Amino acid sequence: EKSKSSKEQKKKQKVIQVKEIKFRPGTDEGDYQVKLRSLIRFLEEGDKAKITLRFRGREMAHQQIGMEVLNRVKDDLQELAVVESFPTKIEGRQMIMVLAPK
Amino acid sequence: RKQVSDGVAHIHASFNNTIVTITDRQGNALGWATAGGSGFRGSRKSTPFAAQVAAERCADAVKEYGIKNLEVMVKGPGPGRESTIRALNAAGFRITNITDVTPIPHXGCRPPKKRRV
Amino acid sequence: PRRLPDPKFGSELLAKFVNILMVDGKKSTAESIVYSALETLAQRSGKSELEAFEVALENVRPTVEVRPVRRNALAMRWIVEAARKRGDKSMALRLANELSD
Amino acid sequence: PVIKVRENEPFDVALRRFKRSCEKAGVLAEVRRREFYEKPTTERKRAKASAVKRHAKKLARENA
RNA sequence: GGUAUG
RNA sequence: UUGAGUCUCGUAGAGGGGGGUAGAAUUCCAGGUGUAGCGGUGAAAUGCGUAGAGAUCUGGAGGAAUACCGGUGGCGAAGGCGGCCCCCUGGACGAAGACUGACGCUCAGGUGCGAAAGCGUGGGGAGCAAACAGGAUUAGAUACCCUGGUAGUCCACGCCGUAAACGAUGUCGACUUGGAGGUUGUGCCGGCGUGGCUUCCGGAGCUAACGCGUUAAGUCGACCGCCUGGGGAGUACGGCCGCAAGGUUAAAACUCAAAUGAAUUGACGGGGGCCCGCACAAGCGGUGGAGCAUGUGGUUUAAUUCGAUGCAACGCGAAG
RNA sequence: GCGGGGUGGAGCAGGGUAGCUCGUCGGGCUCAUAACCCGAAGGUCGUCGGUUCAAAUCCGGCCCCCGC
Ligand SMILES: NC(=O)OC[C@@H](O)C[C@H](NC(=O)[C@H]1NCCC[C@H]1O)C(=O)N[C@@H](Cc1c[nH]cn1)C(=O)N[C@H](C(=O)O)[C@H](O)c1c[nH]c(Cl)n1
Ligand SMILES: [K+]
Ligand SMILES: [K+]
Ligand SMILES: [K+]
Ligand SMILES: [K+]
Ligand SMILES: [K+]
Ligand SMILES: [Mg+2]
Ligand SMILES: [Mg+2]
Ligand SMILES: [Mg+2]
Ligand SMILES: [Mg+2]
Ligand SMILES: [Mg+2]
Ligand SMILES: [Mg+2]
Ligand SMILES: [Mg+2]
Ligand SMILES: [Mg+2]
Ligand SMILES: [Mg+2]
Ligand SMILES: [Mg+2]
Ligand SMILES: [Mg+2]
Ligand SMILES: [Mg+2]
Structure with a gap:
C-alpha cells in the first residue's frame, strides 16, 4: 500500500556513513589542509571519518612519522571531534583512527 | 458491469517498461496491466517476456466484459x-x-x- | 577445438555406462557392479535388463537444446552421480535403487 | 503504419506486414534520433562523414 | 567488458 | 573598346526585413473511464501516485521549434539562412543586342556588419538547462549517472565585438594537360554544343613532407595584412573602447637549448579485422582443508654455508 | 537531579533462537600496490540474582556511565 509513504516519512529520520580520508606519511601542508577541510565537512554534516595512514615499502620503518600526522589531525579537529579509536600497532601497513561528530 | 463486443488494446511500449491497457472504442478504460506489475522489477521490466506476461494479465482483467x-x-x-x-x-x-x-x-x-x- | 558393444547385451549405451561408473581404469570392477545392478533391477521390475535401464534413462534424459548423444551421456552421468551420493551399502544396490527411482 | 487484417489472413503473416510497415515508415529510427539533443555542428558533421563514406564506396566499387 | 597507479 | 558599368528580357535560390497562419509534439489545466503502480539505473535511490498517479479518451491554455522533402543540394561578403502564404527588399546568372567610354584594381587610418555566451531595461517562459538542491557512484567525487531546477535559451530596444569567426589558404587580374559527377541557365538538331556555381580524383609543376593541382599550394603581375626560437604573454604598463564582463593596441626583465612541422620504424590502445595453443569451453582427476615428506621465506642461532626469486626461484645447483 | 545505554578490539543490530561495520590476522587476485575476493580469531552479551520453559531478552537492585 501507499503504506510505503509511511516509510518515506520514516526515512526522513536520518543516517550516518563513515567517510574515509587516506593520509600518507609525508603529505604536504596544502593537501593536508584540503583533506582536513574534507573532514571538517564530513563531520559537521553528521558523519564519521575512518582516517587511514598507509605506509608503503620501507616507510613502515619510520611508523613514528605517521603517528605524528594522525596526532596533528586529532589536535586540529579538536573542538569538532571525539576520537572513537586511535591505533598503536601498524597492522598491515595501516593506522586507522576513527573520528566521530562531537 | 457492461459487455463490450469490440475493444482497443493500447500498448505503451517504453524502453524501460510496457503498459498494456484495454479500453472501449471510445477510449474508456476497462482494464490495464504492466510489466512492472507482473512480478518484474528494475530492468527485468524491459524484456519482451515481461510484456508478454503483462498482456496476459490485461486479457484476464477484461474477461468479464466479454471482448x-x-x-x-x-x-x-x-x-x-x-x-x-x-x-x-x-x-x-x-x-x-x-x-x-x-x-x-x-x-x-x-x-x-x-x-x- | 579451434579446428565397442558391451559383451553381455550388445548395447554400447551400457558399455558407455560402465565407462562412466569406472574409476582408475578398473573396468572389470565396474562391469560387475553394473551387471549385478541390471539383474537386481530386472528382479524388482520384470523386463529384459535394457528396457528397465532405458525407461530409467527416459526420466533423467534432459531436453539451449540438448542433442541425443549428450542427452544419454548426461542422463547416465547424473544417474551415476546420484547413485554414488546415496546411503545404500554397495554401489550395485545404490545403482539399482537409483535406477528404480 | 495502419494495418487492417484483410479478409481471412493469419496473424503471423499479418504481424510481418505490420512490422514491415513500421520498418519502411521509419518510426523506431525516428524516436531514437529524437531521444537526445544533437546540436547542428554534430548533425552537419555526421551528415558529412556519411556523404564521404557513401561516395568513397562508389570509388571503391569503381577502380575494381 | 572498461579502475587507477608505477 | 577589349577592363568596368548602364539598359532590355528571362531564370534558380533556407539571401534579408515585416506581418499572418498551419499541422505534429512536449508540458500544464479541466473532465470522463479506470486501478496500483509510475518513473529511473550498471545496480539503485531520490521523485511522482489511493487527496487516484501512470495509462487511455474529450476539450482547453500556452510557449518554442518546423518531421518527411533534404541532397559533399541551394543562397549569402562573412557571421549565417529551412513549414506554408503575402508585403517590402538586396545580390547572382544566361540570351541576344543597344549604350557609356578606363569611369579600373587594392586599400594604412576610417566606417559598418559580425555565431554563442554575456550585459542593461521591459516582456515572455512549453521544452531544455549553467548555478543550485536532493539521490547515487567512489579512496575521494566539488564530476561523469538519476530526480528536480534558477539564470539563460524566446521577443523588443540598446550594449558587447569575440570563436578551431577554418578552406587554419587576403583581394583583383592573366596564363597553364586531363577524367568522373552535382546544380542552374541557354542555343542548335534523346543527341550535339555553350555559359555560371559546385563535389571528387589526378597530370605537369610546386611542396619538408603531407599534399595542392584551371575553384592551385602551378606560372606571373597589382595592392594590402602579417611573421622573425620556446616559455614568460596576447601578460604588464600606457592609450582607446565598454554599464560591466572584458575587448583592442602591446613590451621587458628573466629563464631554457631547445620549442616545432611532416613523415619513418617499432611499441602501445578500455581502436578495427583475420588466426593459433588443454588459452577458454566440454570433461575427467587434482591443488587449496587433514597428517606427513620436501624446498623456500621468515624468525631463531655460535653457525643455522653459498647460490636460485613473477611467468622463466621455491622435491631448483644437490644424481642422494 | 533526570535519562539513555552498557553486545567480539571497534562500535551498533539483536522476551528464548548473538550478528553487522571497521579493526585483527592469514590467504586469493596483480608484474606490483591500493581496490576487489575468501577464510579464521575475537564475545557471552554491565553486574547481581530472582523470575520466565528462556536471561542480551523479563523484573528489580547495583555498577554505572556520560547527555543533561
Ligand atoms: N567513482 C569513482 O571514483 O570510481 C568509480 C568509477 O570508476 C566507476 C566507473 N564509472 C564510469 O565508468 C563512469 N562512466 C561515465 C558514466 C558514469 C560512470 O559509470 C564504472 O565502473 N562504471 C560502471 C557502473 C558503476 C559505477 N559504480 C559501480 N559501477 C559502468 O557500467 N560503466 C560503464 C563503462 O565502463 O562502460 C559506462 O560508463 C556506464 C553505463 N552506465 C553508466 Cl552510469 N556508466
Ligand atoms: K583609396
Ligand atoms: K527556468
Ligand atoms: K615521402
Ligand atoms: K589595456
Ligand atoms: K628569450
Ligand atoms: Mg549563402
Ligand atoms: Mg560559419
Ligand atoms: Mg578590393
Ligand atoms: Mg544570444
Ligand atoms: Mg535581458
Ligand atoms: Mg531537466
Ligand atoms: Mg542533470
Ligand atoms: Mg581572434
Ligand atoms: Mg586565422
Ligand atoms: Mg588532387
Ligand atoms: Mg607552400
Ligand atoms: Mg589583455
Whole structure:
C-alpha cells in the first residue's frame, strides 16, 4: 500500500556513513589542509571519518612519522571531534583512527 | 458491469517498461496491466517476456466484459512491441487492425541532453 | 577445438555406462557392479535388463537444446552421480535403487 | 503504419506486414534520433562523414 | 567488458 | 573598346526585413473511464501516485521549434539562412543586342556588419538547462549517472565585438594537360554544343613532407595584412573602447637549448579485422582443508654455508 | 537531579533462537600496490540474582556511565 509513504516519512529520520580520508606519511601542508577541510565537512554534516595512514615499502620503518600526522589531525579537529579509536600497532601497513561528530 | 463486443488494446511500449491497457472504442478504460506489475522489477521490466506476461494479465482483467475483437495501438520503441500483441492473440482475441501510434514531432520541443556514459 | 558393444547385451549405451561408473581404469570392477545392478533391477521390475535401464534413462534424459548423444551421456552421468551420493551399502544396490527411482 | 487484417489472413503473416510497415515508415529510427539533443555542428558533421563514406564506396566499387 | 597507479 | 558599368528580357535560390497562419509534439489545466503502480539505473535511490498517479479518451491554455522533402543540394561578403502564404527588399546568372567610354584594381587610418555566451531595461517562459538542491557512484567525487531546477535559451530596444569567426589558404587580374559527377541557365538538331556555381580524383609543376593541382599550394603581375626560437604573454604598463564582463593596441626583465612541422620504424590502445595453443569451453582427476615428506621465506642461532626469486626461484645447483 | 545505554578490539543490530561495520590476522587476485575476493580469531552479551520453559531478552537492585 501507499503504506510505503509511511516509510518515506520514516526515512526522513536520518543516517550516518563513515567517510574515509587516506593520509600518507609525508603529505604536504596544502593537501593536508584540503583533506582536513574534507573532514571538517564530513563531520559537521553528521558523519564519521575512518582516517587511514598507509605506509608503503620501507616507510613502515619510520611508523613514528605517521603517528605524528594522525596526532596533528586529532589536535586540529579538536573542538569538532571525539576520537572513537586511535591505533598503536601498524597492522598491515595501516593506522586507522576513527573520528566521530562531537 | 457492461459487455463490450469490440475493444482497443493500447500498448505503451517504453524502453524501460510496457503498459498494456484495454479500453472501449471510445477510449474508456476497462482494464490495464504492466510489466512492472507482473512480478518484474528494475530492468527485468524491459524484456519482451515481461510484456508478454503483462498482456496476459490485461486479457484476464477484461474477461468479464466479454471482448473477442481488439484493435491494437502500439506506441514507442519498447522491447515489448510485438511480444504483447502475439500474447494478446494467444489469449484468443481476433486482432483486426494492427497500427503504430508513436508520437513524432514535426521539427517540436528540444530533447534532453545526451547521456555521457 | 579451434579446428565397442558391451559383451553381455550388445548395447554400447551400457558399455558407455560402465565407462562412466569406472574409476582408475578398473573396468572389470565396474562391469560387475553394473551387471549385478541390471539383474537386481530386472528382479524388482520384470523386463529384459535394457528396457528397465532405458525407461530409467527416459526420466533423467534432459531436453539451449540438448542433442541425443549428450542427452544419454548426461542422463547416465547424473544417474551415476546420484547413485554414488546415496546411503545404500554397495554401489550395485545404490545403482539399482537409483535406477528404480 | 495502419494495418487492417484483410479478409481471412493469419496473424503471423499479418504481424510481418505490420512490422514491415513500421520498418519502411521509419518510426523506431525516428524516436531514437529524437531521444537526445544533437546540436547542428554534430548533425552537419555526421551528415558529412556519411556523404564521404557513401561516395568513397562508389570509388571503391569503381577502380575494381 | 572498461579502475587507477608505477 | 577589349577592363568596368548602364539598359532590355528571362531564370534558380533556407539571401534579408515585416506581418499572418498551419499541422505534429512536449508540458500544464479541466473532465470522463479506470486501478496500483509510475518513473529511473550498471545496480539503485531520490521523485511522482489511493487527496487516484501512470495509462487511455474529450476539450482547453500556452510557449518554442518546423518531421518527411533534404541532397559533399541551394543562397549569402562573412557571421549565417529551412513549414506554408503575402508585403517590402538586396545580390547572382544566361540570351541576344543597344549604350557609356578606363569611369579600373587594392586599400594604412576610417566606417559598418559580425555565431554563442554575456550585459542593461521591459516582456515572455512549453521544452531544455549553467548555478543550485536532493539521490547515487567512489579512496575521494566539488564530476561523469538519476530526480528536480534558477539564470539563460524566446521577443523588443540598446550594449558587447569575440570563436578551431577554418578552406587554419587576403583581394583583383592573366596564363597553364586531363577524367568522373552535382546544380542552374541557354542555343542548335534523346543527341550535339555553350555559359555560371559546385563535389571528387589526378597530370605537369610546386611542396619538408603531407599534399595542392584551371575553384592551385602551378606560372606571373597589382595592392594590402602579417611573421622573425620556446616559455614568460596576447601578460604588464600606457592609450582607446565598454554599464560591466572584458575587448583592442602591446613590451621587458628573466629563464631554457631547445620549442616545432611532416613523415619513418617499432611499441602501445578500455581502436578495427583475420588466426593459433588443454588459452577458454566440454570433461575427467587434482591443488587449496587433514597428517606427513620436501624446498623456500621468515624468525631463531655460535653457525643455522653459498647460490636460485613473477611467468622463466621455491622435491631448483644437490644424481642422494 | 533526570535519562539513555552498557553486545567480539571497534562500535551498533539483536522476551528464548548473538550478528553487522571497521579493526585483527592469514590467504586469493596483480608484474606490483591500493581496490576487489575468501577464510579464521575475537564475545557471552554491565553486574547481581530472582523470575520466565528462556536471561542480551523479563523484573528489580547495583555498577554505572556520560547527555543533561
Ligand atoms: N567513482 C569513482 O571514483 O570510481 C568509480 C568509477 O570508476 C566507476 C566507473 N564509472 C564510469 O565508468 C563512469 N562512466 C561515465 C558514466 C558514469 C560512470 O559509470 C564504472 O565502473 N562504471 C560502471 C557502473 C558503476 C559505477 N559504480 C559501480 N559501477 C559502468 O557500467 N560503466 C560503464 C563503462 O565502463 O562502460 C559506462 O560508463 C556506464 C553505463 N552506465 C553508466 Cl552510469 N556508466
Ligand atoms: K583609396
Ligand atoms: K527556468
Ligand atoms: K615521402
Ligand atoms: K589595456
Ligand atoms: K628569450
Ligand atoms: Mg549563402
Ligand atoms: Mg560559419
Ligand atoms: Mg578590393
Ligand atoms: Mg544570444
Ligand atoms: Mg535581458
Ligand atoms: Mg531537466
Ligand atoms: Mg542533470
Ligand atoms: Mg581572434
Ligand atoms: Mg586565422
Ligand atoms: Mg588532387
Ligand atoms: Mg607552400
Ligand atoms: Mg589583455
